[model samples]
Target: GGLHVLLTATPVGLTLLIVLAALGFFYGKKR
Candidate 1:
């Protein structure tokens, strides 16, 4: 639900940053 709100209300640049942050976190964990 919080993620959904972020997706809907945030600017595209902010959203992209958030996605990159999440991906980087997961990738680092996976590695």
Candidate 2:
């Protein structure tokens, strides 16, 4: 699956993407 490929290819990249998305959502709610 594509998800597995991403995890194996760049796990850190995926983690940072998730973290940034979460931060954006919370920051938007705070504003």
Candidate 3:
């Protein structure tokens, strides 16, 4: 079976990805 979970995008380099995604969404999308 598969598990579906909503994570806050932490752990190692994943933080960078999450920050990028956030910036792309909140800042880039606004541009």
Candidate 4:
């Protein structure tokens, strides 16, 4: 329930995490 609320309650939170992951992947690749 807590995990669901933290993410489902604010869809943007999940989206932000995904974007952050993508950025980290590309950043690591460049380096």
Per TM-score, the best of the predicted structures is: 2
Runs with alpha carbons beyond 4 Å of true place in candidate 2? 1-8
Give the least accurate 10-residue stretch of model 3, judged by summed lDDT. Answer: 1-10
Model 2 lDDT per residue over 1-31, tens place: 5976777578787777889899999999996
Pick by lDDT: 2 or 4, better one? 4
| Model 2 score (lDDT) | 0.82
TM-score, every prediction: 0.59, 0.62, 0.44, 0.61
Candidate 1, residues 1-31: lDDT per residue as tens digits? 5877776666875778888899999999995
Considering TM-score, which of the candidate structures 1 and 2 is the better prediction for this target? 2
Query: What's the residue-level lDDT of 20 in candidate 1?
Result: 88
lDDT of 4 by residue, 1-31 (tens): 5976777569878788889999999999996
User: Each candidate's lDDT (Cα)?
Assistant: 0.81, 0.82, 0.61, 0.84
Best by lDDT: 4
Q: Answer with 3 or 4, whichever has the higher TM-score.
A: 4
Q: Between the candidate structures 1 and 3, which one is better when assessed by TM-score?
A: 1
